[PDB]
From Swiss-Prot:
Entry's family note: Belongs to the protein kinase superfamily. CMGC Ser/Thr protein kinase family. MNB/DYRK subfamily.
Shown residues within the full chain: 134 to 480 of 763
UniProt-annotated catalytic positions: 154
Modified residues (Phosphotyrosine): 7, 12, 26, 44, 86, 186, 188, 313
Residues with the Phosphothreonine modification: 269
Region (Disordered): 275-306
Domain-related comment: The polyhistidine repeats act as targeting signals to nuclear speckles. The histidine-rich domain (HRD) region is intrinsically disordered and promotes the formation of phase-separated liquid droplets that enhance its ability to phosphorylate the CTD (C-terminal domain) of the large subunit of RNA polymerase II (RNA Pol II).
Subunit structure: Interacts with RAD54L2/ARIP4. Interacts with CRY2. Interacts with RANBP9. Interacts with WDR68. Interacts with SIRT1. (Microbial infection) Interacts with human adenovirus 5 E1A protein.
UniProt PTM: Autophosphorylated on numerous tyrosine residues. Can also autophosphorylate on serine and threonine residues (in vitro).
Organism of provenance: Homo sapiens
Modified residues (Phosphoserine): 177
Residue ranges of domain Protein kinase in the record: 26-343
Connected disease: Intellectual developmental disorder, autosomal dominant 7: A disease characterized by primary microcephaly, severe intellectual disability without speech, anxious autistic behavior, and dysmorphic features, including bitemporal narrowing, deep-set eyes, large simple ears, and a pointed nasal tip. Intellectual disability is characterized by significantly below average general intellectual functioning associated with impairments in adaptive behavior and manifested during the developmental period.
Protein name: Dual specificity tyrosine-phosphorylation-regulated kinase 1A
Tissue expression: Ubiquitous. Highest levels in skeletal muscle, testis, fetal lung and fetal kidney.
Amino acid sequence: KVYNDGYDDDNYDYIVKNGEKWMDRYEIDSLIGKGSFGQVVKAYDRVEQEWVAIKIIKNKKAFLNQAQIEVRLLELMNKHDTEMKYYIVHLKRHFMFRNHLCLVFEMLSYNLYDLLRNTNFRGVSLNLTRKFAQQMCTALLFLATPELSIIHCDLKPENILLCNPKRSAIKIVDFGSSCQLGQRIYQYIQSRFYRSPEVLLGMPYDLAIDMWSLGCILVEMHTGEPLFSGANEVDQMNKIVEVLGIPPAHILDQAPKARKFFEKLPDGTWNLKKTKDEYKPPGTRKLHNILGVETGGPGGRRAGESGHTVADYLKFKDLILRMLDYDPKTRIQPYYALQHSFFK
Ligand SMILES: NS(=O)(=O)c1ccc(-c2cnc3[nH]cc(-c4cccnc4)c3c2)cc1
């Protein structure tokens, strides 16, 4: 009947109220988002004199413990990064309030899904895509710091925010499903569109799963549509195969989930399993053609615009192919990605 002396609801969320004042400091403005974790509100900080984003965790032990691991990762990042220059959202502080853990972040503008929607899902230019690619590669190089070794584990357009609507700066949010490198505890990770082959196949994985995600993300920013839009795991693998061909035999030989997607013929080679109810043959949906390297960009809409020549498109195509390498050991790393001709 009553949850937390009337402050909470049945679903463990704080009942957010316009104009409420917390601790004689934070003036609550409005609800901006909700997740499984809880809620996120926009608020004004009267001591520091600036707008902030407050992540209000649910009043329940399972989410409280999850949030504590996030708080550990951000304070570890803040320790190494004092100058605030590696493109991760800054955690200013955290506090307990009416039995809720609250995390105080810097206020940024909208996310990259919202930008895609504002283009009518037609995508942004190659000049802006280059600038997002550079900052994201720099961000992944920071997470690959040996003392950190952080895997975000859920990179998508929703978790990339623009700092200011009228500038090109971006930041990565939401380390709630993140972890430091180690022994495998989880197999069902990453959002399906952005999920690596090694995860689909049930194999060992490391920080390279974020680089696969980034490759998928950068094509989507320019074309406006998801590169691999699986409705289930079997659809996801089939769309990956359409573009990149059948995975190498020596990986499928080790993969415990290979037979969910493929089948091993008498000759020792792997073939796709049939479906109930229309795919192009392996590797015939070329990225060259998806990007429109010789036909003026996605949908022919970039023909005549500067920074969209055939030479510029081949630099982008090449970089993206190295990010979508099947083998996580040879897939390009943040340091080397920054040295590509696309950023030169
Ligand atoms: N207009 S909107 O699409 O509803 C929206 C929602 C939240 C945010 C926003 C602004 N600043 C933020 N700082 C930290 C976050 C954030 C993001 C994801 C998970 N937890 C906090 C965060 C989110 C911006 C725009």
